[PDB]
Amino acid sequence: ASIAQARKLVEQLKMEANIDRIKVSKAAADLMAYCEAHAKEDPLLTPVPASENPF
Amino acid sequence: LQSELDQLRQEAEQLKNQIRDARKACADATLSQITNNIDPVGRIQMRTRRTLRGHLAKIYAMHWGTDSRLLVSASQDGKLIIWDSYTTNKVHAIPLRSSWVMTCAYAPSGNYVACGGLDNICSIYNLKTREGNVRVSRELAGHTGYLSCCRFLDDNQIVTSSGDTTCALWDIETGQQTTTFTGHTGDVMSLSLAPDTRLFVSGACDASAKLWDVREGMCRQTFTGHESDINAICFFPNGNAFATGSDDATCRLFDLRADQELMTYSHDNIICGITSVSFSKSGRLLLAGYDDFNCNVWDALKADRAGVLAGHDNRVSCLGVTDDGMAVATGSWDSFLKIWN
Amino acid sequence: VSAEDKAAAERSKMIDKNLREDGEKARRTLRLLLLGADNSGKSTIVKQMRIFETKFQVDKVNFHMFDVGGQRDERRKWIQCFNDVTAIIFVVDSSDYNRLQEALNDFKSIWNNRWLRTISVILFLNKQDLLAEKVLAGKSKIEDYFPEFARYTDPRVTRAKYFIRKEFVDISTASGDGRHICYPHFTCAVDTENARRIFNDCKDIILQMNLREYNLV
Amino acid sequence: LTAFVLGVFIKFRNTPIVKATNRELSYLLLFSLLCCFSSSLFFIGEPQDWTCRLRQPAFGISFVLCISCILVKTNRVLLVFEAKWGLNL
Q: Which range of residues forms the domain containing residue C103?
């Protein structure tokens, strides 16, 4: 029953290791860029005017 | 289990010490080193603006409509209700064949709603019909475990996650089986389709989540950073990250390109587990529904609590932000839906 | 307010009226969970059947007993759905003492459950017909698989049958008092007071929960 | 003696036998019994006007309080034994 290891040593394991990985900095200061560029259009960080708010 | 298990068990581990070494090599920062100088979002407060009462039994799921107005609530009373958040009106009340339902979803077009529970079947309902009522469109059977999360890809294909360690995608028109995503070693609890709808992530009860290729069919990567079951998952708005809500009193987030864990979002005083998570509109606020009848609001960049959403006398099981990020639709076991700000 | 909005509000009012109508029917009945082992024969515990659910009413009160099937041997996540039932029926047959250790470990796991801390259990010891014919001969006794199954009080059959009950009540009263209490019974294949015992246990369960809800216990 | 009974009641506040009877209603009944005992002191002594006006009602109100406490205390427990009245009612 070499299927428990095959899918876990040559299908999934051998494929997950062969993935291009970037340094964490370019993802941290990419989520940061996304949240900074979308601060004006986020109506929970900056509450909308009462008239604009439908609730 | 032959000589290829005194060999191919180590060779099933050689790619684990040569992956963590690869993983721990591309880490020149943590999240709280480039997000340190950004001023905090402050003591974010949010009062309830609409309390959608009407359910009797405990609420288990709640999905927002694409139009930012309608929402569907799933409760253990065997009833599915489509709401009008602006006026708290009840658009529909769809009885369910199985009184035990743990999933609910809204089709992106708004023409369909799906539900599923211990019956191990996803029943998909047609909302707009010439008949004038709500009737089942398909009876998606062929899955052994109880369903735990249903999400609508298009108007004709749906993705479901069940307790038989298999995430799995259907085609509504045929009702048959297109792709079966396998590899999890425990009951899958949550699901979160990517904004581009070409990938999705799912968290099982094995302290691990897998990013699947819905078009291709195999798991791209597995994310192991917890120590207990993952009963909550949600996807970053930008499509390059996601957060895991686990029952070990912590909620971590991961980056798809980094293939690592970024922050933990844990407090010493909090012991109860997390049930649901969601990013609001830009990923700065990470809403998280906990088990002690509360729902903390986390500044994702700073990993500090910005506010609490108390007001439920029973544990919070549902949590979802609207499409335009104008309100939240937390629902708890007290059979009460609530809309915040 | 617009006329269309007014009609929508009236439709919503009808929706709540119909939803509330079903609440009385839902609350009238009593919900039970059936669980145990494969060899327990849980199906024939209720010989009058009238998720494999059954709907039997004795003394003109309806009970809905749910037998969960198809799920794996975890019960870790779908048991966090039944924390509103009246009780859980844990049926275990004592035909073999090799599996009674596993059965009592399962009972320990399900009794000491975080979501099942305030729900009681009614213990049904199924298949008491062959216990006599397994202990009358004595060709394989429980002391072979257990240290001190050598004292308990046909006389021999009863002294053999009360030791498992002593172990199970020891497990039940090990941890957790007042909120939930086990109800050890003795069930047979040809026994007829199986549903009667279930009813006589759940009425006392309701009485205890009302005592706690009126703060008298 | 009534004060001592009250003291042993409060000292053992959380106890199944004490909780078996209505604890707050038992406290009220004990206070009413204290009042009934005190109402006997009005009779002894020189009969004034105020003590003659507050003599018989003093015992009557206290005793009817005691009997009402007994009645309601055994009415709640009688009603919980039902088939299928308040913390302050």
A: 3-214
Handedness of CA D12, D13, D16, D22 (dihedral sign): positive
Instruction: List beta partners, residue B84.
Output: B70, B89
Name the residue type at position A54: P
Cα–Cα dist B46/B37, whole Å: 25
For C43, residues 6+ apart whose C-beta sits below 8 A from its C-beta are C49, C52, C67
D54: DSSP letter? T
Which residue bears the tokens 């019974």? C185
Residue C208 token pair = 């205890």
**A-chain residues within 8 Å CB-CB of B183?**
7, 12
Dihedral, A41, A44, A45, A46 alpha carbons, nearest 10: 70
Which chains pack against C, by 3+ Cβ pairs within 8 A?
B, D
Q: How many domains does chain C have?
A: 1
For residue C185, the domain's CATH number is 3.40.50.300
Using the Cβ of B118 and the Cβ atoms of chain C, whether some distance falls under 8 Å is answered with yes
Q: Are C101 and C145 in contact (CB under 8 A)?
A: yes
Among D19, D84, D87, the residue with its CB nearest the CB of C206 is D84
Give the separation between CA B159 and CA B153, rounded to whole angstroms: 7
DSSP D5: H
Domain range list for chain A: 3-55
Rounded to whole angstroms, the Cα distance separating C2 from C6 reads 6
- Give the integer Cα–Cα distance in Å for C56 and C66: 11
Tokens representing residue A42 in the block: 């986020």
Locate all alpha helices (DSSP H) within chain B, ordered by sequence.
Answer: 3-6, 14-23, 31-34
How much of chain B is in helix, strand and coil states, percent to nearest 5?
A: 5, 45, 50
What superfamily does domain A3-55 belong to in CATH? Transducin (heterotrimeric G protein), gamma chain (4.10.260.10)
The DSSP result for A1-55, as a single string, is: -TTTTHIIIIISHHHHSSS----THHHHHHHHHHHHHTSTT-TTTSPPPTTT---
What is the spatial distance between Cα B38 and Cα B33, in angstroms, rounded to a whole number? 10
What does the block give as tokens for D37? Answer: 């005992």
User: Which runs of consecutive H residues, i.e. helices, occur in C29-154?
Assistant: 100-111, 129-135
Q: Do residue B219 and residue A41 have CB atoms under 8 angstroms apart?
A: no
Distance (Å, whole) CA D6 – CA D29: 10
Bridge partners (DSSP) of residue B103 are B116
Distance in angstroms between the alpha carbons of the first and the last residue of chain C? 53
In order of B203, B244, B276, C75, the CA distances from B291 in angstroms are 18, 15, 10, 19
Give backbone dihedrals phi and psi of D3, rounded to 5 degrees, phi first.
-65, -40
